[PDB]
Amino acid sequence: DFLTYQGADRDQRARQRQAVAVRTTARSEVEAKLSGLDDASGLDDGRLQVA
């Protein structure tokens, strides 16, 4: 209570790190779904089926 400002800046750093962690996990999920796309992922299968 007497050193509340030290706790305030520690909590600010913790909240900053948590927010960066959440944003990076969301971006990691997005780039993983982007990187999963390949020839094994179904593309042009409709073209093969219609031919």
Binding site: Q16, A19, R23, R27, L34
Partner: protein
């Protein structure tokens, strides 16, 4: 922390800054009263609990536009003492804005800069906004940049100056103010991004399909250019471009610091559905000569250094495929001594859209700020008009009486003419 200060000078400064901070509060979710319902540290300073203040100063000699912000929809947002007003305007008088009535208001302006400098931990640059066609934008814009260089050494200054157009312009003595202010911003601005209202008139007419654009419509897409320029600092991206990265990759010489600007997707929502906006499709739209925001022909000159700021869902591969097709195009010309003239900036956040703006929700956007030798035609056309002005010495008594000496037009004459000489020989091959 990546923290910058924006300075808006003159009538164009206050009106552009109204559109910029409308985009800036909407990007970070800031409500107009200042309540959040830490990417905002670039522009918004967190004061106490739940309150955010702009890192800007609105100084203008006329009060009628400063009190408009004080009575508009953003009264609770801006700190009221950062907004600087004056008793009377300079009124297209470079002598007034720099010598007579610039003295008593620049002391209050530097005090707000001093208070904002100690508040920010690491300052990255000054985003100065002015119009060189007006008395306050030139004269107070010149005097403030003189004081910024002495007080704050080696800190970058981003200059987005509104420059007079050859055909369409709103005042008679603009060739006097634009030529005199050229001497100040040549030696003192580290980056001078030109702006031309007639080109932005033409950009709005053919792309947005808005055939009666007003000053609100022009400032809204100016706000997108300034936001996408600084979007790398605020939000994490694939290839971050700091403010200091622009000077090291755009200007090869100290006297050459003028760059064009272009925003690639300017598309209405009725145009957005039928148009497939791909990265290669919008990179070609960036380097379109009629899509430049300054009325000049880049085909006439040679490109010297280019910067591409991509936003949204842009993978780092197809930007390179777009760049390779740009290099192979023979219509765009590069200077021989700059084989790698591209700076690429990719940010993952798509640009927000203001409710009420003409722009549509687009996933990907490009802001192109490039250096070319075709911008010697920009100063040459105003050099012809100032030659007619000073030959018969019209409107000089409004300048001589208010402090300025007669030879101050002369010293600004070959200085802008030496800029013509400098731009001609640099682009020349050897």
């Amino acid at each position: 922390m990546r923290e910058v200060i924006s300075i808006h000078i003159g009538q164009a400064g206050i009106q552009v800054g109204n559109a910029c901070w409308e985009l800036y509060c909407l990007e970070h979710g800031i409500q107009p009263d200042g309540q959040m319902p830490d990417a905002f540290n670039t522009f918004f300073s967190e004061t106490g609990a739940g309150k955010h203040v702009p890192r800007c100063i609105f100084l203008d000699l006329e009060p009628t536009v400063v009190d408009e912000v004080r009575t508009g929809t953003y009264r609770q947002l801006f700190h009221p003492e950062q907004l600087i007003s004056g008793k009377e305007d300079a009124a297209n008088n470079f002598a007034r804005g720099h010598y007579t009535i610039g003295k008593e208001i620049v002391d209050l302006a530097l005090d707000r800069i001093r208070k904002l400098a100690d508040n920010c931990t690491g300052l990255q640059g000054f985003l100065v906004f002015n119009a060189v066609g007006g008395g306050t934008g030139s004269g107070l814009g010149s005097l403030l940049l003189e004081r910024l260089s002495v007080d704050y050494g080696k800190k970058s200054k981003l200059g987005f100056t509104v420059y007079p157009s050859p055909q369409v312009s709103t005042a008679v003595v603009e060739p006097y103010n634009s030529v005199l202010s050229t001497h100040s911003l040549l030696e003192h601005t580290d980056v001078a991004v030109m702006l031309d209202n007639e080109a932005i008139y033409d950009i709005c007419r053919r792309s947005l399909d808005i055939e009666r654009p007003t000053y609100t419509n022009l400032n809204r897409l100016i706000a997108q250019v300034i936001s996408s320029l600084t979007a790398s600092l605020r939000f994490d991206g694939a290839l971050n471009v700091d403010i200091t990265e622009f000077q090291t990759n755009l200007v090869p010489y100290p006297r050459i610091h003028f760059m064009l600007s272009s925003y690639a997707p300017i598309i209405s929502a009725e145009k957005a559905y039928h148009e497939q906006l791909s990265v290669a499709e919008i990179t070609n739209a960036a380097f379109e000569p009629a899509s430049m925001m300054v009325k000049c022909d880049p085909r006439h000159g040679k490109y010297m250094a280019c910067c591409l700021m991509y936003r949204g869902d842009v993978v780092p591969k197809d930007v390179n495929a777009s760049v390779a097709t740009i290099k192979t195009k023979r219509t765009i010309q590069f200077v021989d001594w700059c084989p790698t003239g591209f700076k690429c900036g990719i940010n993952y956040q798509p640009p927000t859209v203001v409710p009420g703006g003409d722009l549509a929700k687009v996933q990907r956007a490009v802001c192109m700020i490039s250096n070319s030798t075709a911008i010697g035609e920009i100063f040459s056309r105003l050099d012809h008009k100032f030659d007619l002005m000073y030959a018969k010495r019209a409107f000089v008594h409004w300048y001589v009486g208010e402090g300025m000496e007669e030879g101050e037009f002369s010293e600004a004459r070959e200085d802008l003419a030496a800029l013509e000489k400098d731009f001609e020989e640099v682009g020349a091959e050897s």
